[PDB]
Every structure is written in structure tokens, then in C-alpha cells.
Amino acid sequence: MKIKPVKVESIENPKRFLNSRLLTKIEVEEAIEKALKQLYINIDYFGEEYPTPATFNNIYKVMDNTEWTNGFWTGCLWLAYEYNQDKKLKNIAHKNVLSFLNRINNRIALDHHNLGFLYTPSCTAEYRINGDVKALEATIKAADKLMERYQELIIDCLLNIQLLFFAYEQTGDEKYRQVAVNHFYASANNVVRDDSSAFHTFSSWARGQAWGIYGIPLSYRKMKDYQQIILFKGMTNYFLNRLPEDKVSYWDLIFTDGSGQPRDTSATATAVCGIHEMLKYLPEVDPDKETYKYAMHTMLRSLIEQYSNNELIAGRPLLLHGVYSWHSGKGVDEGNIWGDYYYLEALIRFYKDWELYW
């Protein structure tokens, strides 16, 4: 299958990225340590329960395993575990995994399309880390449910399908791969506009753009279609060209400095992960490769220096100033758990050779 032509905008004023300082080991390390201090605080606060999708006045409420976002909390714990190998983290995160197994076994609150977001950073993550068999079981069950739904289109489905590529690799069953590949091309052609912008379902919502920026290289790993690199370039350049002075996306990329509109830091964290991933594969002769490298550094630096949480009290997020849903008035200028997750994932990506949960 083919990818429709898209307009790849030239990266405007590339020196805005190229003239910046790369992040040092100590800077990233200190950001990770600050994040983990908050996580350890929140461990005692949440116990075996979960943060709400977004904070309220920058304090998460405590909820059970029933939203679309619970996996991102366990994801934070596993990422912390990547850094310090603390058995305490493993023990809590594994209890979450058992809860996720229970959730899929008993079909509890699973009327959410992105089973990938729920099971990948929680269950597939533990499997990646230590081969836990119940984490594997939950993941395969999640994958099977997704397969059933894809026979009985949203941009974040580009991350959703990673669960299918995993199932293909684990079982050898080609059907997982076929559905994954088919859904990729259908999403790419439909949910991405000709100017390389995006909408949610089939102005430019920043997180939707970032889902594409990360979803595409994730899929590229498993498909190796060069037109995916072109599409990544289209979507990424569109994003970078609409970043404000501090390089942190406003919630909608039609807004910039002086708009008075809230930022969405979660979109920027996700884009940093996406660019980091794509750079593993992008040819050295790509004239924009170095610009991308510096871009992701400048974006992540701003998140660390200007947006990361500095108040270490119960319920605080890792990262401030996200937007959950502007139109519903939910989590507007609030921390959110996926933003926390991708922020920490970006830090871990920069710090170590990280084995992807995705």
C-alpha cells in the first residue's frame, strides 16, 4: 500500500534549534532524580490505586483502574525502575500489572479504543524488563481484543497498533502483522491532512500531531517503508514551524506567543520521544537530521527547565501545563499522566540505550 503525497514544509529558521546547547548527562540525570522524588512521594499517596487522567489545581485525585490513562502511571514506575532498579518500584508496578490482567479478564471499563496505551506501558513494559509471564498474558489478551475490534480511525491508533506488532513477534502469527500494517496505511492516508497536519478522527491539535510524530517511527521500526520517513518529516516540520519561542507547543498549533492560550506540554514530550526514535534510523545524509537532533534537545531542555514540577508534595505531576480536553474543559492547564509518562520516557531515552516497551 502507498502513502498519499504530503507537503513537507521546510524547517523555518533552523538556527533556532541548531544554535542551542545539547543537554548534558548531569542535567538529564538531575531531571530524572527530581521526577523520581515526586514518583516516590506519589507511590505512598496512590498506593495500589491510580492518578486521574489530569490534575486538579495541579494535584491528581486518586482513582481505580477504570480510565484510558491508567497504564501511563505504571509506565512512570517502570521507567523509574530502568533508572535505579529499585525492587519497591517493581513490586508496586507488578501489582498494577495484576490489576490490568484482572481488568482484561473481566472486561472492566474497556470501552476505550487505545488498548495499546493501557497495556503497553504497564504489561508489555514488565515483559520487556523481566519476562514476567502474567504481563505477557495480559498483553496477548489485549492484542486479541484489539484484533476482534478491528474486524467487528484515530491518529493515536498509530501507537495502538504497536501492541499488534508485539503479538506478531511473540507468536509468529502473521495475522497480527497484517492487521497492524493495514491499519497503519489507512490511518496515515486518512487522519493526516495534505499539509501534514492532523485531526483526531476520520486548526491543529498539538497532541494529535505528536501522536503522528511518534506513531510513525514506531511503525517504521516494524515496516521499514521509506515513505514513513517522508510522512514523519511532513508532520514533524509542521510541528516545529508552529512552536513558540520556548519551543513548547501551545495546545493547538494555531496559537503561539501572546495568544494567552494554555500550553500542552504533553504534546511536546511525545514529539521529543518521536524525534528521538526516528533519528535512530534517519540517514546521516538527511540535511535536516542534525536540525532534528538539536530540536528535540531544545524542546526537552525547556520542559526540564521551565515546565517540570518543582513542588515536591503529594499528588503533584511530573510535568506542568498540559491540556487534556479544551472543548470539554477537562485538565486545562493541568498536569496529566501521559505527559508525565512521555516526559520521563524522553529523559530515559536521552540517558540510556532504552529498550522500548512499544
Swiss-Prot record:
UniProt key word Iron: no
UniProt catalytic activity: beta-D-4-deoxy-Delta(4)-GlcpA-(1->3)-beta-D-GalpNAc6S + H2O = N-acetyl-beta-D-galactosamine 6-sulfate + 5-dehydro-4-deoxy-D-glucuronate
Active site: N114, D156
Keyword Hydrolase set for record: yes
EC assignment: 3.2.1.180
Comment on activity versus temperature: Optimum temperature is 37 degrees Celsius.
InterPro entries the record matches: 6-hairpin_glycosidase_sf (IPR008928), 6hp_glycosidase-like_sf (IPR012341), Glyco_hydro_88 (IPR010905), UG_Glycosaminoglycan_Hydrolase (IPR052369)
pH dependence (UniProt free text): Optimum pH is 5.5.
GO biological process, one term: polysaccharide catabolic process
Effect of K330I: Prefers unsulfated glycosaminoglycans compared to sulfated glycosaminoglycans
Membrane-spanning residues: none
Protein family (similarity comment): Belongs to the glycosyl hydrolase 88 family.
Function: Catalyzes the hydrolysis of unsaturated hyaluronate and chondroitin disaccharides. Also degrades unsaturated heparin disaccharides. Releases 4-deoxy-4,5-didehydro D-glucuronic acid or 4-deoxy-4,5-didehydro L-iduronic acid from chondroitin disaccharides, hyaluronan disaccharides and heparin disaccharides and cleaves both glycosidic (1->3) and (1->4) bonds. Prefers sulfated glycosaminoglycans compared to unsulfated glycosaminoglycans. Probably required for mammalian cells invasion through the degradation of extracellular sulfated glycosaminoglycans such as chondroitin and hyaluronan.
Quaternary structure and interacting proteins, as annotated: Monomer.
Note: Ser-325 and Ser-328 bind the sulfated group in the substrate and determine the preference for sulfated glycosaminoglycans compared to unsulfated glycosaminoglycans.
Protein's name according to its UniProt entry: Unsaturated chondroitin disaccharide hydrolase
Species per Swiss-Prot/TrEMBL record: Streptococcus agalactiae serotype III (strain NEM316)
